[PDB]
Structures are given as structure tokens and as C-alpha cells.
């Protein structure tokens, strides 16, 4: 039906059919619901004669929001199923409730993303929900940084054992190449999220996030001692596209208040 409509330049009618189908309780897989929404989004973004711009935009917007949530749900499901630390018994249960109609952001957060400590996805969820809560957002940033640091540390350790002759714990895939220093893997995590949310989000309050990253750098010796650029935190946020004025503005505040580790010498 949709194919018929489109060839007749009736894109809006196709977007309507596809969207409703994606919201329906028919037996449709999550990935198919992602395709349906993605098509509707495209079809509603172009003019269809006889239909008001307002009506087009409202549909294009509903498809865009549902598509964002759908992608989150798909990222979850995939990660959970592949997670070595999740019991098989549970995985089958997760696949049943996530590989179907699109769920609310509350559920995705509480029942899955928060339970499995997938903090990066938690952040994407706070973005999609326009979640106004600076403290929780920062708590999640702090957990993500620390989790990533510990994982990078672990991987560098395993490597050091290979290069010394030792044996890795049973069922640990060796690293045939020097993995990245912790500050490199952490900043990788920050970039992946930034590109996904576009810095204009409330999960990038530079006034809170930049001091925390700088704090991390100091309190974990991610500096010259290990061969890192001592300004790496600043480089990171500049390339990311934070305006220069705002940077200096925050750094000033850091210097005046002399908080947490930014003290003495």
C-alpha cells in the first residue's frame, strides 16, 4: 500500500500508515518498527499536495521521537543479549519484552538501562526525555567515567600479563595490541555520546561537566607521568565544539572557588 502511495507522490499518507503500524500491537519486530518509523520520518519531511505544513511536521515529529526511542531500545536489547555477565535465563526474558512494540522511556531506564549499569544509554534516555535534573545527570556522568576507567585499567593489565608470559583468567580474550590509556577510552565515551546528542542537550552542562572531567584527570594521574597531554580535557571539549568564551568562563570559576582537587599548588 505504501509503495503505491509513494509512487503517486502521496508521501504523507504512506507516513501515516507506517507510523500507525509501528505503534500497533501486530506481531512486528523492533527492527522492522525502526524501519517503518525511519521511512515515515522521511515521507513526512517532504511536501505532499493538499496537506498543511503543520500536519506534515506534527507527523514527522512523532516519527522522529519514536525513532529515537526505538534506537535506544535496540541498543539495549543487543547489548543485554551479548553481555557475558547476564544469565541466559534472563536474556530470553529480556528478548521477549524488548523485541516488540516500542516501550516508554521510564521502563527502558528503570527495568533495563539502570539495572545493567549502561550509563551511556541512561544519558541518551535523559536527553530523549528532556529530563531536567542536573544532579542525577552528573551522578550518571560520574558513574560512566569511573566505570570506563576501571575497564580500561583492566584491559591494560591483561595486556601487560601477555607481554610478561603470565596466564589470563579463564575465558578472557587477550589483547594482541596495547589498549588505550584510561583517559583515551573515557574521552571516547564522551565523544560517542556528544555526537549522538549534539552538545545542545541538558546532558552537557559544561559548567558542571568540564570541572568533573578535569577532576578525573587530576585524581587519577591522567597527566604527564604517563605520557598524556596535560591539557587533554580542554582539547577534548574544544574539538567537540564548545565555544571558547564559555570554556574560559568556566575555568575562571574553577580558579576562583578553589574546590575539590583544584587547590593549593
Amino acid at each position: 500500500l505504501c509503495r503505491f502511495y509513494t509512487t503517486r507522490s502521496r508521501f504523507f499518507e504512506a507516513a501515516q500508515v507506517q507510523t500507525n503500524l509501528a505503534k500497533s500491537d501486530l506481531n512486528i519486530s523492533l527492527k522492522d518498527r525502526i524501519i517503518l518509523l525511519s521511512r515515515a520520518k522521511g515521507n513526512a519531511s517532504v511536501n505532499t499536495i493538499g496537506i498543511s505544513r503543520q500536519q506534515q511536521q506534527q507527523l514527522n515529529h512523532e516519527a522522529s521521537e519514536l525513532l529515537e526511542i526505538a534506537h535506544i531500545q535496540d541498543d539495549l536489547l543487543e547489548r543485554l543479549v551479548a553481555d557475558p555477565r547476564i544469565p541466559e535465563e534472563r536474556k530470553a526474558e529480556i528478548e521477549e519484552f524488548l523485541d516488540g512494540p516500542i516501550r516508554t522511556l521510564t521502563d527502558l531506564f528503570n527495568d533495563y538501562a539502570d539495572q545493567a549499569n549502561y550509563y551511556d544509554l541512561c544519558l541518551l534516555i535523559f536527553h530523549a526525555a528532556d529530563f531536567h535534573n542536573p544532579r542525577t545527570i552528573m551522578d550518571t556522568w560520574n558513574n560512566l567515567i569511573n566505570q570506563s576507567h576501571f575497564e580500561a585499567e583492566q584491559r591494560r593489565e591483561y595486556w601487560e600479563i601477555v607481554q610478561a608470559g603470565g596466564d589470563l583468567p579463564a575465558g578472557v580474550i587477550a589483547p594482541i595490541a596495547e589498549p588505550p590509556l584510561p583517559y583515551v577510552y573515557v574521552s571516547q565515551q564522551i565523544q560517542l555520546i556528544a555526537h549522538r546528542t549534539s552538545l545542545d542537550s541538558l546532558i552537557f552542562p559544561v559548567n558542571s561537566l568540564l570541572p568533573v572531567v578535569c577532576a578525573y584527570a587530576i585524581n587519577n594521574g591522567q597527566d604527564a607521568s604517563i605520557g598524556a597531554d596535560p591539557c587533554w580535557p580542554i582539547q577534548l571539549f574544544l574539538n567537540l565544539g564548545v565555544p571558547h568564551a564559555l570554556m574560559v568562563q568556566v575555568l575562571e570559576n574553577v580558579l576562583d572557588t578553589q574546590e575539590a582537587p583544584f587547590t593549593g599548588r
Binding site: 523492533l30 526511542i69 535506544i72 531500545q73 535496540d74 541498543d75 539495549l76 536489547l77 543487543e78 547489548r79 543485554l80 543479549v81 551479548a82 553481555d83 557475558p84 555477565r85 547476564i86 544469565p87 541466559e88 535465563e89 534472563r90 536474556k91 530470553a92 526474558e93 529480556i94 528478548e95 521477549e96 519484552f97 524488548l98 523485541d99 516488540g100 512494540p101 516500542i102 516501550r103 516508554t104 522511556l105 521510564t106 521502563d107 527502558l108 531506564f109 528503570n110 527495568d111 533495563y112 538501562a113 539502570d114 539495572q115 545493567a116 549499569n117 549502561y118 541512561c122 534516555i125 575465558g171
Partner: protein, 757 residues
């Protein structure tokens, strides 16, 4: 001699006793056997259960599950709406009612997880906000975690985890089964042997004792043959613990103390088979080749003699009694005997609708892989005839037929059954109750009366966990079936309704059927076309309600239906004390509101049909007493609503303050005041008139507003308040407020002069 409300209260008291005389399980599962079923298609309006929704497993859990190196496992926490999945040494919980849940991950464990359970906490150990304990068993240790499952605005518990430093090394025995008692005792068993262990834990650390310990209650020694456990089962009402072995041996343990566990019965399959052979009806469905796949304890509240149900792989439900050697020293039983067998139904599931001896040979439930029983007898059986698709047989007691059966010697285990199909690939793992445990009474007689509690507790719902998701199955009440059936009669003849109604009368009797019509007419079942269904229900209540007749008179079935419905709306109130002395209310305020709304909607229904319903309008001796009886019930209804409004008014104030400034006789009268007395006995009315006369006195001391509390008492609880008392209250208002303003000179001469007026 006897006024209306007192006459109607007599009908209520006798109706309460009639509902509480519903046969106990022992009475219709007497020694012998049964194959009584009425099967219903799952898509039929008469289906006893039906699927209401499904919840897929989150995709992230599928990612972890398919990332499993050695071992995975799924399970249910149906009490709080959570499921869990273990992958090797990692555990993930999530709220399955949430549309996009976040995964609560716990990966501290070092070795493979083999069992997980959610149990109550030991009292006086943890902060009150800790609602549960999470037990995590690995191949190396058992770990206790504190849990707080506080409800959220959405209706799904918020789960947060607490560390405890409580753990013990496992030992050599596998742990695959964990169960908890009401008091927080934790018992363990597994697939290494038949031993039962218990985990102890305490708040204080001692130099001679750790915070957490483990002991083997079985004390094994010497020669031991291979045998291990298939499950553990608790019955708190009897302080018993049951184990089922791989050889189908049933062991019973008694908790003679807070730290003791004593084996008191051991009954192997041979003993069960010997009992079975002594029964009148032996069957090839139960032999030495047959396996017992599941047990289900039966609590003492439900039945005195029958302690346990055992399910065979052929689908036979074995009901076992247990008895103590003596009557005094909890008392531990010492014998267990197979007494009664419910054999499988014969009808198999079909895509197309297909068209009196004991049936003891049916293979319809062969093979039964998993089985569950919930009070008052809801039975779920996972039949695995094919290795890819499970079929779910679900049955309930035929409460309507059991209640009407007469005499008692004709009682049999009648059941309503249905087949629920799960899609290809769905392997059922576990089934758990999501709502509060069912109980219509506090003792076996009356316990199983589903009809009595249709409007006091939501229908039972059950979470069916599969490898693909969680399916919600809901028990359907008579009013649900009646409303659905009538919904199909909307487009049919006058005789189409009469035909459907006659089905209900032949099963439930006329009174129960007309009571269901009255309930549907009043909007019951609508929490689930609806105007036409309610109008059809009204038409059924009028047309088929019968009439009064000389035998002393026999009132119509329409009257008994109104009395039955009204009684069941207030059964939780009638005999209960109004207050609990720091005085508080016995019944939560939210419950009093819903009861009042139900009573008022019933009253509204009678008023809107005063002209069309026989007996309401005034009318020879038969119709006379019919009019008097119906009038008395309606006077009790308004009295019930006034009484409830009075109790709500009372606790909106500061009752403890009012209770303090009160005489002893009136404190004692209020101490043992029941709702029945408040509704239907002069002393409740006289005491009510005292309390109102006292609350206003106090209200004036607070002095927020007199004329608002006035109009509050004036209208709603009129006929119990007096207009000469509010004007008096208005006078005592200015008098006390003249004593409040006493220091002022010119303000009193207006207060005292108006008080005098």
C-alpha cells in the same frame, strides 16, 4: 416491633453466614477420585482465564544471554513485578511492567550463579524501608543483598539494592532452590543430594560468631544412594517445609523452633502407589514409571486435612492428607497419605470448535512438565506434547456449581477449564502470582467463595514467564463472564438473552445470576456497547427476577439478589470494629470511599428505575412484604452511606484529642463499636449523636470554620444530625469565640448578643 434497618441488618447477618458456609476443600475432595470438567474455548466469553497483555524481554538481556559462555537462567519476582536473568557470574533485574525498562545490573559475584530468590527479611535486623532480601547463590558462596521495593506513581515498584557484608561459603552441595518463610528464614537445596541447609544472619558482629552462618539440617552419614531435589516448598500456616526429589520422594519437615528443622515424614513413590492401589479406581496414568514433577502446599486456612498437591507427568493431581499421632504436645504431623485424585480432562485444544463415568485414562495432559496451584485452586499445567510449543491448561473450581450443590454428600470437585496457546518457540519457565493471595474467609469453610469477594479484591493475575517474555493471565469473575455474554446479546432477539440467561441459572442458580445482572447494571466489570450491556443487565434484572409467593412468605429472587449484592459490598465492614485504640480507624479511608461509592451507585440505580422495577413502587400479602423488605434494604443503604460519611468526618478531625476529653463509658462504647451497630442499632446512632456534639466543641477550639463544618454535618449525614443542634453549635461558636475575643471590649457585645439570638 422491629424497625426497617434492624430488619434489613438481620438479612445481612444471615447472608454473611451463607457466604461463609461455602464448602471447604476437604468436603468436595473426599477420599476417592473425580474427572469433572466443563471445558471452555479460550476465545469464549465463558473462559475462566484469559491473556490480557504481554511484555517482551528487553533486547539488552538478549544481548547478554546470547553472550553467555557456559550458563544462563531466567526467573520471576511476580510479587513486585520484576524478572531477572543470570549470565555466568552476572545478574540483571528489570521491571517487566515498564515499557522500556532499565536493567539493574549486579556483577560483584566471582563464580557462576546457580539460584536467585527474593525473600522476606528477618525482623529487627534491617531498617524498616528494606522490604525484601535478595539471595544470590553461586558455585562458591551464597550472597545476601538488602532490597527496597517501594511503589512508584506508575504502579511498579522502585528497586534499590543494599550491601550487607553477609555471605557464607557454599560448600560441596549445589544450590538450585531457595525459599523463604514469612519470618525471613532462608532454606537451600539443590541437585547434589537431598540435604536441606539454612542460612542464619544477625545484625551484630561477635568475636565468637559471624554475622552470617550456614548449617546442614539433614545431618547425613554412612551409606547414601544417588538422589537429589526437584524443588522446595514452604507452608507458613503449618510451619512446614516440603522437598520433592528426583525419585518422586516427598519429604516433610517441621519448624519446631525459630532455628530448628526436623524431618517428620518421608513418603516415596512406592507408598503413594500403594495408597493409590487401595483406592476404588486405579489407573494406568499412575505407575512405578510415573514421575512427580511438582508439589504445591495447601495452607491450613484453605483445608484442615489436605496438606499438599502433587502433579504427575501424566497430568494427575494427587491430593495428600497429613495427620499427627496426637492432639497436643505447632503440632508436627507424622503420617501422609494419598486420599484424592483429580484425573486429567479429555478435551484437547483445537483451532476449530469441536462438538458420566470416572475418566481415569485421558492423555490430554501427558506429558506435564511444570505445574502450579494457587488458592482457592487455580491450576496451571505446562503440557509439552511437542518439543517446540508449550500448551497451557488452566482451570479453576466451579465455584458457582459447588456453592449451589445440595446435599453435601453430592459435592464433587467441579472445574471450569480452558487451553491457552503460546506461540511457537515459547518455552514456559515459571508462573507466579502478581496480586495478593486469595482468601474469602479465615478458615476452610467460606475460604474458597470467589463469588463473595468479586467486589472486594481485584481478580487474580498471574505472570507466565517464557524465554521470550512475560504473559499476564487474569482470572475472570462471574460478573466478567455475565457482562461479556450480554455484550454478545446486544444484537439479538428477546429470546436470545433469555437463552443466555438460562445457561447462567442452570450453573449458578437464579439468585447469583440476578445478582450478577444487578452488579453489571451498576457498572461492575466496566473497569474493563457498555451502556447497552448495562441496559441489557437492567432488562435481565427486571424480566427474570421472579416474584414473591406464599409458602411466612418467600421473597423474590430479585430481593435476595439485592441483599446478596449489598452484603458483599460491606462484608469487610459489618462485623469490624470502627476504631483501633492514639486511636485510628480499623478500615483504611480509601477502602471506605470505594465501598460508599458502590453503595451509592446501587442506590442511584434503584432510584432511576423506581417505576420499572417490581416492588419499589407501592402496590396481596406477598407483594406487601416484598415492598416492605425492599424498603428496609434501601433504608439500610442510606444508613450505611451516612454511617461511612460519619466515620470519615470523625478522622478528618483529631479523634485522639476528642477521645481524651471523653467519659469512660463513652470511650468503652466507642472501643467496641462495630459498623453493624453504627448502621442498624440505636446505640450506634445515640453514640454518633454524642460524637458530633463533641467534635464541633473541639472544632470551635481550633476555630477554623464553624459554618463550614455546619453545612458539612447538615446535609450529608442528615437524618442523624439535627438542625436544632447546628444552631446550638452556631450559638456555642459565638460563646467560645466571645471567650476568645474576651480581652476586646467592643467586639463581644456583637458576639454575645448574636449568641443570645
Amino acid at each position: 416491633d422491629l424497625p426497617p434497618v434492624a430488619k434489613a441488618a438481620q438479612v445481612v447477618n444471615q447472608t454473611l453466614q451463607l457466604d461463609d458456609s461455602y464448602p471447604d476443600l476437604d468436603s468436595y475432595c473426599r477420599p476417592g477420585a473425580s474427572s469433572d470438567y466443563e471445558m471452555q474455548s479460550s476465545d469464549s466469553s465463558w473462559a475462566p482465564f484469559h491473556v490480557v497483555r504481554h511484555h517482551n524481554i528487553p533486547d539488552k538481556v538478549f544481548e547478554h544471554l546470547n553472550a553467555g559462555e557456559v550458563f544462563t537462567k531466567l526467573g520471576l519476582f511476580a510479587e513486585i513485578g520484576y524478572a531477572w536473568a543470570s549470565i555466568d557470574s552476572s545478574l540483571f533485574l528489570w521491571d517487566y511492567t515498564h515499557p522500556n525498562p532499565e536493567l539493574i545490573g549486579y556483577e560483584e559475584a566471582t563464580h557462576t550463579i546457580t539460584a536467585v530468590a527474593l525473600v522476606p527479611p528477618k525482623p529487627g535486623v534491617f531498617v524498616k524501608t528494606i522490604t525484601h532480601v535478595l539471595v544470590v547463590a553461586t558455585t562458591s558462596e551464597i550472597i545476601l543483598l538488602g532490597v527496597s521495593a517501594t511503589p512508584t506513581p506508575s504502579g511498579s515498584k522502585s528497586l534499590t539494592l543494599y550491601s550487607t557484608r553477609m555471605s557464607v561459603h557454599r560448600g560441596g552441595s549445589d544450590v538450585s532452590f531457595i525459599v523463604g518463610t514469612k519470618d525471613g528464614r532462608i532454606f537451600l537445596g539443590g541437585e547434589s543430594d537431598t540435604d536441606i541447609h539454612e542460612i542464619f544472619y544477625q545484625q551484630e558482629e561477635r568475636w565468637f560468631s559471624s554475622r552470617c552462618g550456614k548449617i546442614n539440617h539433614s545431618h547425613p552419614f554412612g551409606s547414601r544412594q544417588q538422589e537429589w531435589l526437584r524443588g522446595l516448598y514452604v507452608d507458613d500456616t503449618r510451619n512446614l517445609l516440603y522437598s520433592l526429589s528426583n525419585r518422586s520422594t516427598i519429604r516433610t519437615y517441621h519448624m519446631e523452633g525459630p532455628e530448628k528443622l526436623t524431618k517428620v515424614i518421608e513418603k516415596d513413590k512406592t507408598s503413594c502407589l500403594r495408597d493409590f492401589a487401595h483406592m476404588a479406581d486405579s489407573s494406568p496414568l499412575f505407575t512405578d514409571k510415573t514421575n512427580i514433577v511438582a508439589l504445591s502446599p495447601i495452607p491450613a486456612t484453605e483445608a484442615s486435612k489436605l496438606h499438599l498437591m502433587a502433579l504427575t507427568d501424566t497430568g494427575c493431581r494427587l491430593f495428600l492428607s497429613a495427620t499427627s499421632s496426637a492432639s497436643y504436645t505447632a503440632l508436627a504431623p507424622q503420617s501422609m497419605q494419598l486420599q484424592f485424585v483429580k484425573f486429567p480432562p479429555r478435551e484437547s485444544p483445537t483451532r476449530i470448535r469441536t462438538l458420566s463415568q470416572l475418566d481415569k485414562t485421558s492423555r490430554a495432559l501427558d506429558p506435564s512438565a511444570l505445574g502450579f496451584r494457587f488458592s482457592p485452586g487455580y491450576f496451571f499445567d505446562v503440557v509439552r506434547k511437542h518439543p517446540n510449543q508449550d500448551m497451557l491448561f488452566v482451570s479453576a473450581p466451579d465455584t458457582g456449581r459447588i456453592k449451589v450443590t445440595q446435599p453435601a454428600s453430592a459435592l464433587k470437585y467441579f472445574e471450569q477449564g480452558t487451553w491457552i496457546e503460546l506461540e511457537n518457540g515459547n518455552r514456559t519457565i515459571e508462573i507466579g502470582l502478581t496480586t495478593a493471595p486469595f482468601a474469602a474467609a479465615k478458615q476452610p469453610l467460606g475460604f474458597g467463595n470467589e463469588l463473595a469477594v468479586q467486589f472486594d479484591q481485584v481478580p487474580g493475575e498471574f505472570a507466565v514467564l517464557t524465554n521470550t517474555g512475560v504473559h499476564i493471565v487474569r482470572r475472570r469473575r462471574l460478573v466478567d463472564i455475565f457482562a461479556k455474554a450480554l455484550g454478545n446479546c446486544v444484537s439479538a432477539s428477546d429470546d436470545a438473552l433469555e437463552r443466555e440467561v438460562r445457561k447462567f441459572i442452570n450453573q449458578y442458580g437464579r439468585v447469583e445470576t440476578i445478582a450478577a445482572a444487578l452488579a453489571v447494571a451498576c457498572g461492575q466489570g466496566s473497569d474493563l456497547m457498555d451502556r447497552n450491556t448495562e441496559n441489557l443487565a437492567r432488562a435481565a434484572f427486571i424480566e427474570y427476577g421472579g416474584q414473591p409467593r406464599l409458602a411466612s412468605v418467600r421473597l423474590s429472587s430479585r430481593h435476595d439478589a439485592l441483599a446478596l449484592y449489598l452484603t458483599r459490598l460491606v462484608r469487610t465492614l459489618w462485623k469490624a470494629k470502627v476504631v483501633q485504640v492514639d486511636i485510628s480507624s480499623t478500615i483504611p479511608t480509601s477502602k471506605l470511599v470505594t465501598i460508599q461509592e458502590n453503595v451509592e451507585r446501587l442506590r442511584n440505580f434503584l432510584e432511576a428505575n423506581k417505576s420499572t422495577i417490581q416492588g419499589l413502587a407501592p402496590p396481596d400479602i406477598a407483594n406487601q412484604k416484598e415492598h416492605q423488605a425492599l424498603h428496609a434494604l434501601q433504608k439500610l443503604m442510606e444508613s450505611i452511606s451516612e454511617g461511612i460519611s460519619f466515620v470519615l468526618m470523625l478522622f478528618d478531625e483529631r479523634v485522639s484529642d476528642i477521645y481524651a476529653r471523653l467519659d469512660a463509658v463513652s470511650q468503652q462504647q466507642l472501643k467496641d463499636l462495630t459498623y453493624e451497630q453504627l448502621f442498624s442499632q440505636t446505640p450506634g446512632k445515640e453514640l454518633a449523636k454524642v460524637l458530633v456534639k463533641a467534635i464541633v466543641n473541639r472544632n470551635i477550639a481550633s476555630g477554623a470554620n464553624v459554618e463550614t463544618v455546619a453545612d458539612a454535618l447538615r446535609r450529608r449525614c442528615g437524618s442523624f444530625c439535627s438542625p436544632d443542634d447546628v444552631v446550638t453549635f452556631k450559638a456555642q461558636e459565638q460563646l467560645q469565640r466571645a471567650s476568645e475575643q474576651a480581652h476586646n471590649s467592643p467586639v463581644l457585645r456583637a458576639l454575645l448578643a448574636e449568641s443570645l439570638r
